[PDB]
Every structure is written in structure tokens, then in C-alpha cells.
């Protein structure tokens, strides 16, 4: 199959995700509706169950609503079993309608449906070329009070019906008991509870194994991707081990939720996306989009800076999931606002780099404030809205024009209100023009592009007041008027002669695992695959076609390798960096160093004899380590993904910037567990 096939679970760049709040989409099976005080059929009480379910989604998939829009992927509420409690908050009744209050990761939420219902959903979707993504929140269970066990379900955790433990009397330490987070620091947000939710302790062996076993179940059920909840609130090392588990079994496209506020640019966030084994929801993109197109707090210059900065900050920018709003933000469309604002933002997102995600109902001009006002029941299934049509015309471009899916981004024309950008991949090109100024047209002269000579019709058909583009030799466009609030899309596709890599997935795994390499001009005959300088050919290359290659990772030493391919004739392609070859199966180990004093601004890091520990290279050391919550300074701790059953040598370091102070004496030594977790505790050697 080609790169665009529904079967491609490793790449979503050619797709368009539709974010569904299951309960608020469509109640296709009233028989499974919750009853009494936990339900409101009218969906007037936004905190109770409204009845939306999997059967409903199936119906919507079957009746053309999503397909007619060009949607090729869906992201649904967490499917696992949630508590049944009806909680009274501020005099208001609340339910688990959102799917975030888990009780059993190996069962389904009966309100959504049964396992059989789930299987059917998967089948229905696939039959319509729609990939299925599930929300997964292994960071906590549900609302609890250690002092008052009768409150809710006491964050109880079950294993396929078998009780493991609750928040009260947590002798095994399945959960964290450090109060609630205040988001003052990263460490703080990880080792403390979100709201009143029972925080899961991933260092607990039972929890580790269980969670890993659970995801396997869902993978076995046929999912195509995973949306990881609050990744900024779980230990990074643990998550890396989780991704390894997934990748070394059945790799699927995974992206996490790492919230960013307005004007917020985080290096920690970049690093996580670059080395965790998963990508992230593009908050930087989303926030900038709202500023420029919605709240008028920034202009095109800021939009361009975000695009350029992001492309450099993210090793795999094309893996970031873009959006303009979500279940945790106020709806993009303001009641009294000009609809063109939303239309423009949509078009921008659909034609930009990454993986676009659209929050259900956006296309219906839904308005609403923060939770739960942004989660009303979809008021219509009309295909006649302008927004619907915008998506309908642009979504498919992601499939047919690889420039949109894998291309670079380049500004071609700009002013306070206008932005004209170009996407390019091999012989493929796409040019988009946006004039956010709703009252003034712009006179466009001097525009230069990569489009061949000719005339180009607006892909939007003038829907957003766009126009035809005339390109002479040299890619120079003839003078034209860009209507007030105008938006136009011009594109070109053609055969690519030379092998071009547009995407690789997964990006982190152990030898023997099969990876997917997508792009154009690979040819039909098996060529050669390079991992760094190492060449792979023949048998290990499972399949080879023009747009996609399937190959087994070679048994090279653990480390980072750049990927390249060559056609059967020996022609090399571009290089796709940052591939991570693991040393083997991974386990999550907690490292604790005692009595490591430092000066303000100086932190402790971990280094060692394996790739996972940076192979003694301080620049690749793990950290900075933590010293407030679990353990207190001068004792430091950190959770790390290491190779199972291996004997590892390690040392600690103290660093100020890139300046490094090595721990004295001899190296510490330990043997990693074969499965489950472990905690290594030593004293800093002077």
C-alpha cells in the first residue's frame, strides 16, 4: 500500500483528524445510556451524560457526514471503564461523561459501548479509510480523598475486574500522596495530583506492568494511534519506556498533550517531543493562530516567526498535531464575531505543516466558553456551511499533494495583515495567501514562487474570496488584488525523479523492529536503506514501493542515526535525522543520588555506559534531576528508561550550563530488571 493508505499506522501527516467528544456527538444506542441523575437527554446540563456513543460514530461514518468533509481520522474520548459516581461540585452534579476518570484500563466504558461495539467501530472506520485514535490517560484514575474513602470511588484501580487498590490505605503505593500541583514547576506538576485526581505512581512495579499490558490490549484491538493525556504530568523516562513497549510490539502514531499558554515557548517541551518517542499537540501553533486571527493580539510577523522557529525547534515538525481550539479552551468562534475569522484559521491549519486536528462542531460555528461550555452537543449535521466546505476542499489536498503533508514552509509575501506562504516537497508545490484584514484589500506585487509557468485556479473556488493566479517564468506572479478577508490556495503536483524522504515512523525502537519510510521517487525495485553509515538491503527490506518502504532495523549499537535511502540504481535521497536505535527492551528505573550539594543554578545529572544514559557524553546526560517532591535536596532523583537485564555502569554530574563536574571515585554498577521497575540508590562520591 502507499503512504496514504488507511493501513499506515505510523504516519498521519497525510490525514485530517476529527476530534470527537463521544458523549456529545451522536447517541446511536439509547439502550446504553446512563440513567437517573447521571443523565440529561436534552444535554442541557453539560456535566452529565448526554448519550453519545460508539454506535453513533459508526452511523456518522456510514452516513457520509465525516467522509463528505474529507475527514480521514478520528480521535475519540478515552474508551476505558470510568467510575459511575455522580459527584457534587459547588452544588452541581458531575459525571465521567468526558472519559478521563478511569477505573479499569482493560474494560470499556459501557456508556460508549462494549468491546464488540469497539471492534465494530474499528471495522466501520477502516472500511471508510478512517484511522482511529484513542485518548489514553494513564496519569491518574479518578477523583479521590485519602481521608474520606466514601467519596466517589476513592480512585480505585481494577485489573479486568480485579481490585488492585484505592487512594485510601495505599500501602503498596500505587498512587502519589503529595497533595495537589500548583504548576509552579515541572517536577511539581509531575509528582503531585491534577485537581483532586488520584495520581498514578509509575515507579510502582504493578502499575508499570499493568499499564503496559493494558495498552497492548488496545493495540490488539486494532487502534491506529494514541493521544496521550497530560504528558507534562508524568515522568519523562517512564513515558519513554512506555513508548518503547508500544514500539517494540505494535508501533502506532502517538502524540501527547503538553499545554502551552499565550506567548509561551518551551525548550523542555521541544526536548520531550524530540526524544520521548512521541510527538506533541502543537500548542505553540494554536496559541499564535488565535492571537493573529481571533483576538488580534499579534500580526502576520508573529505568525511567520512561529512557523520558522517551530520548524527549527522540533526535529520532526511534521509530527506535531495542530489545531485552533479544543475541549479545554473557549471555542474559536465568538458569538458576535465574523465567521471569516474561523474560516481563515481553518484553511491555514489545513494547509500548514504537521497533522491537523479539528474539534467536533467547529464546522457548525459552535460557540462556548471554558469547560463545560465548550462541550455542547453538536447542533447540526449540515454540509452546507461555509466552514464545512472549506474542510471538504482542503482536507483531500493532504492526501493528493505531498507538499502539504511533508513539505518545507517558506514565506513569500508579508505585511501586517497578509501572509503568503509556500509548501514544497520534491516536484510538488502549494502556495497559500491569507488577508486577515476584513476591511481592506491588499495589492500584491513582487510575489515569487516555485510554481511552474501557468495559470492556477483557487482550490477553494473563490469560496473565501480567493482568485486565480498567473505565474510567468521564474515563478514570478503577475500583480493581483487580494480581497479583504481573502484566502486562496494554489497547487501543483508532478512525478518526483529522485528518492525523497518525507516521513519516518516510528522514530525510536530496538533492532529487528519494522519501521516505515514514506515519500516519493523510491522506485519499484528494492534499493538500499542506510542507518547512519550502515547499509541494509535484501531480505531485511520487507517491502519496497515508490511511496513507501518497510524495513527491519539493523542490529547496530544503541544510538542516534540519520536515515537515508538509495534507489536500485544507487541514487541517494535526502537525510532524515534523529532516528533512535534502542539497546533493547526498556525498563523504567529510578535513580537516587544522596548528598550531592550544589550552588544555585547548578544541577545534578546522570551519565553512563549505555546509549540510554548518553554513553558518557555529558552533553547527553540525563536531567536536570529533581530534588523537591519525592526526595529532598541534597538528595536528587530521576526516572529513566534503560535496557532490560543489562549490566550498566554510571556516574553523576554537576553542571552549570555546559560546565561539568564529575563525580569522583569509581563508576557505580547495577543490573537492570528484566521487567517491571527498580530503584537504584547511591551516595555521591567526592
Ligand X SMILES: OC[C@H]1O[C@H](O[C@H]2[C@H](O)[C@@H](O)[C@@H](O)O[C@@H]2CO)[C@H](O)[C@@H](O)[C@@H]1O
Ligand Y SMILES: OC[C@H]1O[C@H](O[C@H]2[C@H](O)[C@@H](O)[C@@H](O[C@H]3[C@H](O)[C@@H](O)[C@@H](O[C@H]4[C@H](O)[C@@H](O)[C@@H](O[C@H]5[C@H](O)[C@@H](O)[C@@H](O[C@H]6[C@H](O)[C@@H](O)[C@@H](O[C@H]7[C@H](O)[C@@H](O)[C@@H](O[C@H]8[C@H](O)[C@@H](O)[C@@H](O[C@H]9[C@H](O)[C@@H](O)[C@@H](O)O[C@@H]9CO)O[C@@H]8CO)O[C@@H]7CO)O[C@@H]6CO)O[C@@H]5CO)O[C@@H]4CO)O[C@@H]3CO)O[C@@H]2CO)[C@H](O)[C@@H](O)[C@@H]1O
Ligand Z SMILES: OC[C@H]1O[C@H](O[C@H]2[C@H](O)[C@@H](O)[C@@H](O[C@H]3[C@H](O)[C@@H](O)[C@@H](O[C@H]4[C@H](O)[C@@H](O)[C@@H](O)O[C@@H]4CO)O[C@@H]3CO)O[C@@H]2CO)[C@H](O)[C@@H](O)[C@@H]1O
Nearest distance from C-beta of residue 353 to ligand Y, angstroms: 23
Nearest CA-CA partner of 270 in 323, 315, 324: 315
Q: Where are the beta strands (DSSP E) in 478-556?
A: 480-482, 487-492, 500-505, 508-509, 514-520, 528-531, 534-536, 541-544, 548-552
φ and ψ at residue 256, rounded to 5 degrees: -110, 160
Whether 466 and 427 have beta carbons less than 8 Å apart is answered as no
The single residue among 120, 493, 560, 628 that binds ligand Z, judged by CB under 6 A, is 628
The answer to whether 651 contacts ligand Z (rule: CB under 6 A) is yes
Provide the mask over 325-364, with x wherever binding to ligand Y is found by CB under 6 A and - wherever it is not: --xx------------------------------------
Nearest CA-CA partner of 3 in 364, 359, 253, 347: 253
Span of 106-114, 176-184, 450-458, 609-617 interacting with ligand Y by CB under 6 A: 176-184
Q: Which is nearer to ligand Z, 155 or 608 (CB)?
A: 608
The single residue among 132, 152, 197, 397 that binds ligand Y, judged by CB under 6 A, is 197
Output 567-573 pairs: Cβ under 8 A, ≥24 positions apart: 567/499, 567/521, 567/522, 567/523, 567/525, 567/527, 568/523, 568/525, 568/526, 568/527, 569/523, 569/527, 570/528, 571/498, 571/499, 572/499, 573/498, 573/499, 573/500, 573/501, 573/519, 573/521, 573/522
Nearest distance from C-beta of residue 32 to Ca ion, angstroms: 5
Q: Which is nearer to ligand X, 446 or 570 (CB)?
A: 446
DSSP 611-675: GGGTTT-GGG-B-PPB-SSSS-TTSEEEEEEEETT-EEEEEEEEEETTEEEE--SSPEEEE--SS
Site for ligand X in 411-450 (CB under 6 A): 412-415, 445-446, 448
Rounded-to-integer distance, Cα 403 and Cα 401, Å? 5
Q: Which is nearer to ligand X, 417 or 663 (CB)?
A: 417
Whether 323 and 349 have beta carbons less than 8 Å apart is answered as yes
The answer to whether 27 contacts Ca ion (rule: CB under 5 A) is yes
Q: Could you tell me which residues are beta bridge partners of residue 225?
A: 133, 253
Nearest CA-CA partner of 658 in 611, 605, 597: 605
The answer to whether 316 contacts Ca ion (rule: CB under 5 A) is no
Provide the mask over 263-302, with x wherever binding to ligand Y is found by CB under 6 A and - wherever it is not: ----------------------------------------
Q: Characterize 237-254 residue by residue with b for buried, 16 or more Cβ atoms within 10 angstroms of its Cβ, and e for exposed.
A: bbbbbbbbbbbbbebbbb
Whether 23 and 56 have beta carbons less than 8 Å apart is answered as no
Nearest distance from C-beta of residue 446 to ligand X, angstroms: 2
Span of 60-68, 145-153, 543-551, 660-668 interacting with ligand Y by CB under 6 A: 145-153
The single residue among 2, 179, 462, 512 that binds ligand Y, judged by CB under 6 A, is 179
Provide the mask over 383-412, with x wherever binding to ligand X is found by CB under 6 A and - wherever it is not: -----------------------------x
Binding residues with ligand Z: total (CB under 6 A): 14
Q: Could you tell me which residues are beta bridge partners of residue 199?
A: 140
The single residue among 4, 11, 13, 33 that binds Ca ion, judged by CB under 5 A, is 33
Rounded-to-integer distance, Cα 429 and Cα 412, Å? 13
The single residue among 23, 170, 199, 458 that binds Ca ion, judged by CB under 5 A, is 199
The answer to whether 206 contacts ligand X (rule: CB under 6 A) is no
Rounded-to-integer distance, Cα 39 and Cα 442, Å? 52
The single residue among 578, 598, 661, 683 that binds ligand Z, judged by CB under 6 A, is 598
The answer to whether 430 contacts ligand Y (rule: CB under 6 A) is no
- 3-state SS, residue 543: strand
Nearest distance from C-beta of residue 616 to ligand Z, angstroms: 4
Nearest distance from C-beta of residue 653 to ligand Z, angstroms: 9
Site for Ca ion in 206-235 (CB under 5 A): 233
Site for ligand Y in 76-135 (CB under 6 A): 89, 98, 100
- CB atoms under 10 Å from CB of 84, counted, come to 16
Site for ligand Z in 527-546 (CB under 6 A): none
The answer to whether 221 contacts ligand X (rule: CB under 6 A) is no
Q: Are strands 321-322 and 355-359 parallel, antiparallel or unpaired?
A: parallel
- 3-state SS, residue 300: helix
Contact residues for Ca ion (CB under 5 A)?
Answer: 27, 29, 32-33, 51, 53, 199, 233
Contact residues for ligand Z (CB under 6 A)?
Answer: 185, 598-603, 616, 627-628, 633, 651, 662, 667
Contact residues for ligand Y (CB under 6 A)?
Answer: 89, 98, 100, 137, 143, 145-148, 179-180, 183, 193-197, 229-230, 232-233, 257, 259, 261, 327-328, 371
Contact residues for ligand X (CB under 6 A)?
Answer: 412-415, 445-446, 448
Amino acid at each position: 500500500a502507499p503512504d496514504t493508505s488507511v493501513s499506515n499506522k505510523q504516519n498521519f501527516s497525510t490525514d485530517v483528524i476529527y476530534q470527537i467528544f463521544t458523549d456529545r456527538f451522536s447517541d446511536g444506542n439509547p439502550a446504553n445510556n446512563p440513567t437517573g441523575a447521571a443523565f440529561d437527554g436534552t444535554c442541557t446540563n453539560l456535566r452529565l451524560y448526554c448519550g453519545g456513543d460508539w454506535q453513533g460514530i459508526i452511523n456518522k461514518i456510514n452516513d457520509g457526514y465525516l467522509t463528505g468533509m474529507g475527514v480521514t481520522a478520528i480521535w475519540i474520548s478515552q474508551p476505558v471503564e470510568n467510575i459511575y459516581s455522580i459527584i457534587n461540585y459547588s452544588g452541581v452534579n458531575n459525571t465521567a461523561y468526558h472519559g478521563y476518570w478511569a477505573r479499569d484500563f482493560k474494560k470499556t466504558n459501557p456508556a460508549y459501548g462494549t468491546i464488540a461495539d469497539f471492534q465494530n467501530l474499528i471495522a466501520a472506520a477502516h472500511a471508510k479509510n478512517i484511522k482511529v485514535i484513542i485518548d489514553f490517560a494513564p496519569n491518574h484514575t479518578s477523583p479521590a480523598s485519602s481521608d474520606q474513602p466514601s467519596f466517589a470511588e476513592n480512585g480505585r484501580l481494577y485489573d479486568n475486574g480485579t481490585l488492585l487498590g484505592g487512594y485510601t490505605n495505599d500501602t503498596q503505593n500505587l498512587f502519589h500522596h503529595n497533595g495537589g500541583t500548583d504548576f509552579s514547576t515541572t517536577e511539581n506538576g509531575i509528582y503531585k495530583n491534577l485537581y483532586d485526581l488520584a495520581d498514578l505512581n509509575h515507579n510502582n512495579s504493578t502499575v508499570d506492568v499493568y499499564l503496559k499490558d493494558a495498552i497492548k490490549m488496545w493495540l490488539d484491538l486494532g487502534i491506529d494511534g494514541i493521544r496521550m493525556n497530560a504528558v507534562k504530568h508524568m515522568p519523562f523516562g517512564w513515558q519513554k519506556s512506555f513508548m518503547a513497549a508500544v514500539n517494540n510490539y505494535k508501533p502506532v502514531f502517538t502524540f501527547g498533550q503538553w499545554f502551552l499558554g499565550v506567548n509561551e515557548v518551551s525548550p523542555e517541551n521541544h526536548k520531550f517531543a524530540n526524544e520521548s518517542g512521541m510527538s506533541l499537540l502543537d500548542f505553540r501553533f494554536a496559541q499564535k493562530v488565535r492571537q493573529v486571527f481571533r483576538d488580534n493580539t499579534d500580526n502576520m510577523y508573529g505568525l511567520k516567526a512561529m512557523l520558522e522557529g517551530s520548524a527549527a525547534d522540533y526535529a520532526q515538525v511534521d509530527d506535531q498535531v495542530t489545531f485552533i481550539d479544543n475541549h479545554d479552551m473557549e471555542r474559536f468562534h465568538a458569538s458576535n464575531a465574523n465567521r471569516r475569522k474561523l474560516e481563515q484559521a481553518l484553511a491555514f491549519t489545513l494547509t500548514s505543516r504537521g497533522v491537523p486536528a479539528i474539534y467536533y462542531g467547529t464546522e457548525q460555528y459552535m460557540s462556548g466558553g471554558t469547560d463545560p461550555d465548550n462541550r455542547a452537543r453538536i447542533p447540526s449535521f449540515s454540509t452546507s456551511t461555509t466552514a464545512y466546505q472549506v474542510i471538504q476542499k482542503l482536507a483531500p489536498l493532504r492526501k493528493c499533494n505531498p507538499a502539504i503533508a511533508y513539505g518545507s514552509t517558506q514565506e513569500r509575501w508579508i505585511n501586517n495583515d497578509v501572509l503568503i506562504y509556500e509548501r514544497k516537497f520534491g516536484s510538488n508545490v502549494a502556495v497559500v495567501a491569507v488577508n486577515r484584514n476584513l476591511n481592506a484589500p491588499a495589492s500584491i506585487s513582487g510575489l515569487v514562487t516555485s510554481l511552474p509557468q501557468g495559470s492556477y485556479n483557487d482550490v477553494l473556488g473563490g469560496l473565501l474570496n480567493g482568485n486565480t493566479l498567473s505565474v510567468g517564468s521564474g515563478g514570478a506572479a503577475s500583480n493581483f488584488t487580494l480581497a479583504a478577508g481573502g484566502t486562496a490556495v494554489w497547487q501543483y503536483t508532478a512525478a518526483t525523479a529522485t528518492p525523497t524522504i518525507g516521513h519516518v515512523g516510528p522514530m525510536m525502537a530496538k533492532p529487528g523492529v519494522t519501521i516505515t519510510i514514506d515519500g516519493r521517487g523510491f522506485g519499484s525495485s528494492k534499493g538500499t536503506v542506510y542507518f547512519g553509515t550502515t547499509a541494509v538491503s535484501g531480505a531485511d527490506i520487507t517491502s519496497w514501493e515508490d511511496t513507501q518502504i518497510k524495513v527491519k532495523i539493523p542490529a547496530v549499537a544503541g544510538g542516534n542515526y540519520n536515515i537515508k535511502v538509495a534507489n536500485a540504481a544507487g541514487t541517494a535521497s535526502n537525510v532524515y535525522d534523529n532516528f533512535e536505535v534502542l539497546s533493547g527492551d526498556q525498563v523504567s528505573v529510578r535513580f537516587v543520588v544522596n548528598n550531592a550539594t550544589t550552588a544555585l543554578g547548578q544541577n545534578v545529572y546522570l551519565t553512563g555506559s549505555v546509549s540510554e544514559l548518553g554513553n558518557w557524553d555529558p552533553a547527553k546526560a540525563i536531567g536536570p534531576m529533581y530534588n523537591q517532591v519525592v526526595y529532598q535536596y541534597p538528595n536528587w532523583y530521576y526516572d529513566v528508561s534503560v535496557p532490560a537485564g543489562k549490566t550498566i555502569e554510571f556516574k553523576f554530574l554537576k553542571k552549570q550550563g555546559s560546565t561539568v563536574t564529575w563525580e569522583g571515585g569509581s563508576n557505580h554498577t547495577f543490573t537492570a530488571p528484566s521487567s517491571g521497575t527498580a530503584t537504584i540508590n547511591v551516595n555521591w562520591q567526592p
